[PDB]
Design a protein around this ligand. Sequence first.
Ligand code: IHP
Lengths: 29, 314, 717, 210, 106
Amino acid sequence: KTKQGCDILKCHNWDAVRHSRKHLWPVVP
Amino acid sequence: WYEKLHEWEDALVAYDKKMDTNKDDPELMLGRMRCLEALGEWGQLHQQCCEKWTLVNDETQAKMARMAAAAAWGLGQWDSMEEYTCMIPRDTHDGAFYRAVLALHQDLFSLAQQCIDKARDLLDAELTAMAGESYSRAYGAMVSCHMLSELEEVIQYKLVPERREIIRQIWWERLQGCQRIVEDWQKILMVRSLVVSPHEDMRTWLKYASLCGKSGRLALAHKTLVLLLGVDPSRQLDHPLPTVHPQVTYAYMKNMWKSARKIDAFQHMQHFVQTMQQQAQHAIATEDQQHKQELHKLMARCFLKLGEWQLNLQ
Amino acid sequence: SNVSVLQQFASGLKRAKAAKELQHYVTMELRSTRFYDQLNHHIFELERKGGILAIASLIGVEGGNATRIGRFANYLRNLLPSNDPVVMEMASKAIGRLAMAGDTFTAEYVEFEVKRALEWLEGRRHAAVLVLRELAISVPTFFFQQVQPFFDNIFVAVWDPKQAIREGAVAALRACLILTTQRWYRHTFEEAEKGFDDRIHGALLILNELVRISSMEGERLREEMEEIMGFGTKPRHITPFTLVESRCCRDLMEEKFDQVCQWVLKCSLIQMTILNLLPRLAAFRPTQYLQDTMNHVLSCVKKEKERTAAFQALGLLSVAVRSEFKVYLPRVLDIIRAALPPKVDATVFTCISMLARIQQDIKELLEPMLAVGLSPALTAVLYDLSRQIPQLKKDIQDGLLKMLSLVLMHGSITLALRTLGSFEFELTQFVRHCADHFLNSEHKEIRMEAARTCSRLLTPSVSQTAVQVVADVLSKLLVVGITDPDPDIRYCVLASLDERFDAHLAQAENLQALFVALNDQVFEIRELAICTVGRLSSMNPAFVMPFLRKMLIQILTELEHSGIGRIKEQSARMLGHLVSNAPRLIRPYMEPILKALILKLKDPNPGVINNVLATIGELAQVSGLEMRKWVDELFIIIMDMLQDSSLLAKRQVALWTLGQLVASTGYVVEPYRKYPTLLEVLLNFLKTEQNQGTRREAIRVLGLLGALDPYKHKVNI
Amino acid sequence: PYMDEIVTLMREFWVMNTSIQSTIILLIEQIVVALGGEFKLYLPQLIPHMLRVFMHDNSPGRIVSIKLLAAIQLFGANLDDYLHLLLPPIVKLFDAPEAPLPSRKAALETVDRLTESLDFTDYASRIIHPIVRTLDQSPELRSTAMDTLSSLVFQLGKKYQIFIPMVNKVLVRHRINHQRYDVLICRIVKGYTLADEEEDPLIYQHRMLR
Amino acid sequence: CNPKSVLKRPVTSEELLTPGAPYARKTFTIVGDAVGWGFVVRGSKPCHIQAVDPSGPAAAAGMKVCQFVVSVNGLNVLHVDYRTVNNLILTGPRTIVMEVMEELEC
Ligand SMILES: O=P(O)(O)O[C@H]1[C@H](OP(=O)(O)O)[C@@H](OP(=O)(O)O)[C@H](OP(=O)(O)O)[C@@H](OP(=O)(O)O)[C@H]1OP(=O)(O)O
């Protein structure tokens, strides 16, 4: 649920969604 | 006269006789630098150019600049190559190529592109005139433009990491068409060193090492083998040769047979082949597609040399 | 076809003439010959300006090699005998332009013209000088065939009792002297000295040319006055297709000073020449002489028709020696102190800028310059002074900002907007108000500059105080870029939205505005729009990709179904932009695209071929080591366009794509054996071709393929 | 099964300027009715011949083009992937001043008639701009051109709202008062509902049919 | 062996900082070239100029070998390593604003 938490999972070959639900058309920055 | 014959080993001793007996004008010393560069001994060339870089005429050191820069590049001392490069004339083919490679070291890709383009037009005049006689005459310049196209692939090598598996595949087959000359391969292989270290491709350096021993100097062919191994087998003789890199150590044993050791090589060959069978077996992992076939192929060569050498000895 | 051409020629002969000539050149290049020749003959016989302009416009476009040279040679000699008005000067330039086309008979025509001009060397001397100068400029090599007779002829023609004739001879002599110096000094000095001992402007002009040729230090300052990123950037992944005078110097200076001191009020041509000669002498020969030159310039500064010449001369002297004008600069400042407030003014700003290149004099002089007016010279001079000498950057910025704010409160307004977007300033209030000019003003010129300055004024691009304003002004630009009537305004708006705005154009609302621009009547906007969405596609693929798939099929539909050479050329160009800009998306679509283009090359029009070959160049970079099964069947098509080229078409694209699909595929040494002619033809291209771009490409192809030893060349024959 | 040869046969004998032109056009109108939905399989094969009739036609008054514009209206929804290359030739017909007036009349009519069965939302700027430069140019095409524009504003939802300042400038200069266009603009400037704005034109057409 | 060294003066620290009389500060702006500017600085504390290409653009606009620099492109670099100065100039624009000590033959 946090940017810091997603980085830990990425090291162990686990991906996660990096956008909230307020906008239904996410854009990768 | 020896330089015009491309015979440098007796040229160096000729210059030493005229200089060791007595120091003379800065013309004989410049001749040695043209001989040390051809032989490929950057260690002796670097100390001569650095010491003489101060007490010479400004015009005299302009000619010395190009040879001094090559010596610095060969030893990897990039802190001193910059000083020598800035004095090479900028209106010559060698004046742009030697500073284009400087930008690659310091990661200046935009600047290097203009230098490569600048060198192409300067080399154009020297190429059209030579091409008017015959292709054989215009070969010393065509190898120069071959090296220019290598610098563009160096830029691509450092940018896209996904292509560093076919870039070092073109460089192999492209080198199979060039004339088998030690001097020509010495410059080409030196360019392919800003990105790929020799330990990353023994398939190319082993071929160059064989070329130097077969037709040129055995001393040069010997230092290129200890570099790949990482240790010098000539220092310690009782200890067995390194087991890793079976292809590299196989070439080293043949070098001993050619030069002076027809008995020590045979003893080392028996130990090397003996350890191969144990290494081949006791391997749970199966790699019969490539590794097992390649290992078995090396076995036939090793056994064949045993029969030939034993008959020669006994 | 002929009726419209005849009507256009008559209208141009009698801005309308320039527009007609440009339209005729475009139509002639796109595309009858007898009708055009008959119209030109009638125009030349009758008027004169239109006939010369039409011939010049058709020169270098139709492609006349020798047939057009002969017809134009007779026409050129017809107007050479009589020195017509300034309109005939274009005919002389047109003759020079035709002679510079590089024809076989051009050398013979130049020699014939030189011989004819030599006899003439004021309805003959003036025409000969202009003709000789045009020939020398167009063909410097042909002008050196006979230079000794030209110098003797010029020395006698310049002595004639005329004023405008000497101006042309001096320019012709300077051009000849420049050509000689680039590759007679005693003869020129002796001739000038003999005439020095009506004979005022001519003598000074000859001496001025020698001084400028001998010393070019002062010429650089004059050129600069008349006129007024990074080594560490990574390349793009997919690159698309692209002596005697010095010895006799004190005597000449003494003679010039005596003439200036004596001929103070006795002779305007001499006064103008004296001021011009003074800056050359001051720079070449640097305190009695300096004081006398300043006094003469000061006397002519207040004189009529001489302030502009004196102002330029004073600035040149100050640049040559700072100590000489250290205390004499106040006189120029005092004279211009009340002159600026009183408001011809173009030279006033030029003198200040020239004399500037100490830091306290410009502190108060800025106010008088502000009230002088808004002119391009004033803005250029102020910007140059600030960059060269940033003594008071805040003071210069404050004055420019104050004037700009007052101007924008209520054609002159367009210059103010350009200055704001020209260089950096120290701005959220301006961008909000700048979004009102183009929404209300109906002038087309003001909206073109208003769009450009808005994008450049958006430099501040994590706080919710500036995100709203930049997102608001960006909305208006998108609306104007798609809802403007003439395509000229729409074209500049989309060009402003460069790669820098990638992070802000990915919003859902902004994407809809760009999607409208994809289907536009003009191709220049569709070509630009498709490139923008391609880069923007990798950012928000949920919106762009569904629309691109429908668009991609339509591009390939036009290639095969529509049997029109113009449409196929149009679609192929757009295809190249899409692949060269969004490589990742097009990578899985190699097979449908390559097969379509290959069939196009083997059709049983230069426009289509030059574009499909360029497109294949980008397709060979995106798909590394994948375009391996088509190289064998692609070399045959490419090689036929180089070897045995029946038509001298554009081989640069074929050469460029040949070396582009071998550096990525890996096919290097093998082609030298299958085609035992590729090595020979590439070497032949070095001597035959003269273009620098093509030559630098043939060398690269040779390096990429290899450096095979000469023996293997013999084996391959 | 035999349609492949028929299309191929017509390719050779359809010379651009010959007495056998109208029977070829009349043959097309009978074929499209027969297939009635699957004509798109063979439509692209005859497009290149049809393309060079709107720019290379020596018939007096452009009767051949007019007789062909009436045939395009019968295609209806058959052309969906071919509208991108067949529309620019149509829009090039009613903006050229030198074209005969009856030919320009049919080009305006064939768009509004084709609107009833196709979606022109994507091709918005392609045909809106040529219309706004025809109202100020020809004072005799005011009535017929507004009908085509009005038939297109209906498909567009609130996305047309940004084009109002373009057209409002032309109308106040020439005093054009069209009843139907007045209704549509009112619903956009001031809200009417929420389920009607930004509505897909094909869904609305299907709803009215059923 | 590795270094050469050019300037006679061993150290110039605390001397350039004081209002030295023999020298006079000057500012040089050098424009880029197709192959590079052609100057090298190899001074530890003062960052003195090591060598200048005689045919390079720098030699055209003065820029003699025996010079010291204190500020580059506005930023003051009076007390930094030579390598850091090289990093800054490369990262900067093509045109470089340089201040030269230009000792007056002393
Ligand atoms: O010079 P030699 O002692 O007779 O060795 C040769 C030589 O090997 P090097 O590359 O080490 O010089 C051959 O290479 P070429 O220079 O002639 O190309 C190589 O042939 P390949 O290049 O085809 O591998 C051949 O190998 P082989 O025995 O497999 O035919 C090998 O012979 P030895 O390994 O038996 O010494």
